[PDB]
RNA sequence: CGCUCGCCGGAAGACCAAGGGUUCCUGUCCAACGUUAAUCGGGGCAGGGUGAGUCGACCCCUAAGGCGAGGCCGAAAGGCGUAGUCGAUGGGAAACAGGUUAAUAUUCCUGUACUUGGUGUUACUGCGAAGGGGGGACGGAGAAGGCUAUGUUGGCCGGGCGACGGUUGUCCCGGUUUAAGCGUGUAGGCUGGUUUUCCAGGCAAAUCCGGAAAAUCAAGGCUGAGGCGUGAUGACGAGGCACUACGGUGCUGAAGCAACAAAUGCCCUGCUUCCAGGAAAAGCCUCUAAGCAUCAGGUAACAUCAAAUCGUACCCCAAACCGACACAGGUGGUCAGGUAGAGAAUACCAAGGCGCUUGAGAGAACUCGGGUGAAGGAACUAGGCAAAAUGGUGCCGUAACUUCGGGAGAAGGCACGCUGAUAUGUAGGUGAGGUCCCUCGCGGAUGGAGCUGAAAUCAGUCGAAGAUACCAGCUGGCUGCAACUGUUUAUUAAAAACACAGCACUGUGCAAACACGAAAGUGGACGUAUACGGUGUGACGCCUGCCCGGUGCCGGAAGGUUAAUU
RNA sequence: GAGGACCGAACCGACUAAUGUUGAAAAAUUAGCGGAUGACUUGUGGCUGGGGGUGAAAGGCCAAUCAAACCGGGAGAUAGC
């Protein structure tokens, strides 16, 4: 049992993009920004508990942050974790 | 047999092989094999400490029984074999109880021969006894220097030792070097001579044949510069000095034995 | 023509990395020196 | 964007490791960067993009080597190393085909699979390791056979009837693809099998391995490419049809066979042969010990659950890596089509990729890179430097000398294209139907349809020339030096120098001499005088003379002299 | 079907010439050249450290540095020039 307090911290935001929208309307898969240290099992439990939908499978990847310039200053955005969450057929989010 | 190669190429003109159509053609006996990787003549400081060693063929180590202390149980020679680790051939022997061992192959030993060790073994080639029980005047090999330590003298192909005398607890031996040496009579020895006497008749024939054996080139000191070797230097071929090692010690007759601990056992030096 | 710098990350880290520096007293004195100088990058360790 | 032209194509194509790190895709901008302009960019800015039980890492296991509790050694710092613990470049489970994005895909989707482990039932049951045994597990070269990848031709299906003479045909163009998995067990490779009794071996035990003695049977087992079947009534598929936001989308879809040739890939970790004699440890199989006893544990079937985490974009013979540059340099692995060809050479092409980020004119000297040259032909020059020349295959033929192998491709010379016949395509290779047999199958024998196919001879014929291009030895005579193949002054010296097999002297009895080291130790060597070190000489042939006064080395020890000490 | 065998690509070299010499390049390009089953060549990783290593020996090589590497220190060495 993953504690609800942990489940409430692992989902960070929906991910909005053309690929995400196509995933939702073609494969019943929603795309999320998730905490960097979240596992697939944690993501699955959090989606099921908080969004109240049944999940088929979770795929994950780590996005490396870009180096950016700002007023001659060089910086680097943080890496983050993206989750493609496939829902069971018939579920709607 | 000693076979001269035909001169179909300059590198084969001078080659002389020792071909023995009795050695096993298959693989060695695996339970008595160990790996043995190469050193390049370098010690654990990683420094070259013996020059002219490197490369050559990969070799597995055969565990050879130099102690010959399995007394009272006969063994039969199963086959003779090539051993890359030494000049002599070895023989795989099967004991009555089902144990197999490797021994140095004496001259004349062939598959089917029987061997034995111990105080009551027969006086026959390949049998091992304490020298107390071997007749004076006999020819023996694989001679111990301390009882139970294992054979250490006359192990190379074709070598043997003569038991010349027996006085009290000691026997006197004529070694291959010509030295007369006292050894405890409780030390063991194997009857006969080490086989493969034709080993010294081979001719390598080309440089590569030495490279196959792990021997790297010798560079003459007189071919170097003075910073490298006492012999180096000279506008042209010059020498003008007493021959020395690379470290400066005379190398044409100066003696280097210094062992007062073992002096008491040398009846007569080789010269 | 082959030049002198032929990069390998494993060799870089084994030769000059943080744990190699920590393995000897002389390497810990390199680190002490670079800290006293105030280097932003103490070692090659990426 | 289009049409044309040219260039690479064993790469200048495609794909990785390494290294780099957003360079990837889309929009937008042209200051600076880009050796020019730039509307373009690997440039600026913004947004997007990397989806795994099966690929890799992590992980289990070890090599060289590293570290190393105690330990041994050393003024200190430290050195070495035992038990151990790390360390890949090596050993260890499992996924394929098709479709899809602007950008990922063996990761997403469709279809069809597979592996390991945890639980829980059912049935049967001796399980148990830090120990024993097996296995893993290993070289070089060479030779075939059986195959596949792949190609070519025919058949089949669809389309065509030609910008200029001809083209309904023995004509032209295109396609003719299909995986892992599962089943079967073939060419081939290896091994006799089974059952009893006994035993100084495998640190104890062992039913396992090893050994000994009988009985009986003779075929039993292990391994194995390919093919065949299924996977697949599926997928893909030339083209056609309809819209386009003219970039491309949506629908449908024929044939989908055979013969021949054929690898450097597979059978093959095989086989034959040679000497220089060819890792380790775990996974895996098996044996028992202590111990546990209708318990645990094991075996099998079924069900269910789990297989986390990190990498995955993009460049990769390069404008993204190493070279200060968008630098004629360097960079390990994999793939390997057509015609000619021995070929991965070479020429022209395919797929695919490119015209090298200043151009426009002109048509002086001179420089660079090339082409041709009257007569002469080394007169040039230090020197034939450079250039010119030779150049293939088959056959004829080939001297001195020689260590009998060589020299030798010595030298020199002849033939060579195309067409027809021999022979509507030969010798040879391959091989279907049919027939016979069978211990009936992926079988044997016969049989030869079909396919493929040199080489030769005779006759004819075109050109100045038939190894026509690219490609592709110049040859001979005397002589110095080094025997030879090798090595060397990275960047002015490749040699006659170094090495070398062979030879000799000499040291070295093993705790070897010797070498690294205040030392412990380590190398020498798990070697032992037919061995190991040092030194000189340098294949081989015939040989290697005289001198021990000097210097050194070896032996001697009666005498002289002589240190600390007393 | 032997061989430090033979011809010859890849691969490893570097004998000659021209060019280049503020280079396309701080050692190359082009035409020729040698080895090409071996004393061969190559990837990954390891080991040897400065009077020290390694050296088929050229005082060669040890990061475009070698008759004693590089960096820091004694250090403002000393300099009848
Ligand atoms: Cu004295
Ligand atoms: K031997
Ligand atoms: K020499
Ligand atoms: K000299
Ligand atoms: K000299
Ligand atoms: K000289
Ligand atoms: K290093
Ligand atoms: K430029
Ligand atoms: K312009
Ligand atoms: K842009
Ligand atoms: K080790
Ligand atoms: K170790
Ligand atoms: K299961
Ligand atoms: K073999
Ligand atoms: K066809
Ligand atoms: K026409
Ligand atoms: K039998
Ligand atoms: K199949
Ligand atoms: K076991
Ligand atoms: K990818
Ligand atoms: K070409
Ligand atoms: K002009
Ligand atoms: K002009
Ligand atoms: K003719
Ligand atoms: K036929
Ligand atoms: K025929
Ligand atoms: K030729
Ligand atoms: K000579
Ligand atoms: K040369
Ligand atoms: K030399
Ligand atoms: K000697
Ligand atoms: K001779
Ligand atoms: K000779
Ligand atoms: K003399
Ligand atoms: K003398
Ligand atoms: K005296
Ligand atoms: K190697
Ligand atoms: K040196
Ligand atoms: K440096
Ligand atoms: K120095
Ligand atoms: Mg992932
Ligand atoms: Mg941050
Ligand atoms: Mg050490
Ligand atoms: Mg030597
Ligand atoms: Mg040896
Ligand atoms: Mg020698
Ligand atoms: Mg010299
Ligand atoms: Mg000197
Ligand atoms: Mg002279
Ligand atoms: Mg003189
Ligand atoms: Mg001296
Ligand atoms: Mg590398
Ligand atoms: Mg264009
Ligand atoms: Mg950028
Ligand atoms: Mg781009
Ligand atoms: Mg500009
Ligand atoms: Mg402008
Ligand atoms: Mg950009
Ligand atoms: Mg999935
Ligand atoms: Mg895998
Ligand atoms: Mg240690
Ligand atoms: Mg300690
Ligand atoms: Mg480990
Ligand atoms: Mg590995
Ligand atoms: Mg892509
Ligand atoms: Mg074992
Ligand atoms: Mg192996
Ligand atoms: Mg082999
Ligand atoms: Mg085929
Ligand atoms: Mg096929
Ligand atoms: Mg017409
Ligand atoms: Mg056709
Ligand atoms: Mg099929
Ligand atoms: Mg080959
Ligand atoms: Mg990719
Ligand atoms: Mg450019
Ligand atoms: Mg370049
Ligand atoms: Mg290369
Ligand atoms: Mg071709
Ligand atoms: Mg070519
Ligand atoms: Mg094309
Ligand atoms: Mg002109
Ligand atoms: Mg000119
Ligand atoms: Mg000309
Ligand atoms: Mg002329
Ligand atoms: Mg003319
Ligand atoms: Mg003329
Ligand atoms: Mg003439
Ligand atoms: Mg003249
Ligand atoms: Mg003149
Ligand atoms: Mg010339
Ligand atoms: Mg020419
Ligand atoms: Mg001649
Ligand atoms: Mg065929
Ligand atoms: Mg040419
Ligand atoms: Mg002369
Ligand atoms: Mg020579
Ligand atoms: Mg070299
Ligand atoms: Mg030079
Ligand atoms: Mg040169
Ligand atoms: Mg020792
Ligand atoms: Mg010692
Ligand atoms: Mg030792
Ligand atoms: Mg000489
Ligand atoms: Mg005298
Ligand atoms: Mg004396
Ligand atoms: Mg050769
Ligand atoms: Mg060189
Ligand atoms: Mg060249
Ligand atoms: Mg040659
Ligand atoms: Mg060649
Ligand atoms: Mg110093
Ligand atoms: Mg000199
Ligand atoms: Mg240098
Ligand atoms: Mg000095
Ligand atoms: Mg001072
Ligand atoms: Mg000063």
Numbering used by the authors:
A (entry chain s): 1 to 93
B (entry chain c): 2 to 272
C (entry chain 1): 1 to 46
From the paper:
Since the earliest biochemical studies on ribosomes, Mg2+ along with K+ and polyamines were found to be essential for the structure and function of these systems (1–8). However, such descriptions were hampered by poorly modelled ion binding sites as observed in a recent cryo-EM 1.55 Å Escherichia coli ribosome structure where incomplete ion assignments blurred our understanding of their binding patterns. We revisited this model to establish general binding principles applicable to any RNA of sufficient resolution. By applying these rules, we could assign all Mg2+ ions bound with 2–4 non-water oxygens.
We recovered ≈110 Mg2+ ions that were either assigned as water molecules, K+ ions or not assigned at all. This led to a final model that contains 403 Mg2+, 231 K+ and 21 397 water molecules contrasting with the 361 Mg2+, 168 K+ and 11 461 water molecules initially assigned. The two models share 299 common Mg2+ positions. Although the resolution of a cryo-EM structure is not uniform and less precise in some regions like the small subunit (SSU), we considered that the assigned 403 Mg2+ ions (290 ‘well-defined’) correspond to an important part of the chelated divalent ions necessary to stabilize a bacterial ribosome. When we applied this criterion, we observed that in every instance where d(Oph…Oph) <3.4 Å, the two Oph atoms are linked by a Mg2+ ion, either through inner-shell contacts or, in two occurrences through a combination of inner- and outer-shell contacts. We also uncovered unanticipated motifs where up to five adjacent nucleotides wrap around a single ion. Besides, we note the occurrence of an [A+•C]•ho5C base triple associated with a ho5C base modification assigned as a C nucleobase in E. coli PDB structures. Hence, Mg2+ ions are rarely present at the SSU/LSU interface and are therefore not of importance for the subunit assemblies. No other r-protein binding site was characterized suggesting that r-proteins might have evolved to avoid competition for Mg2+ resources with rRNA. Eight ions are located at the LSU/uL2 interface of the PTC, which contains the largest number of observed contacts.
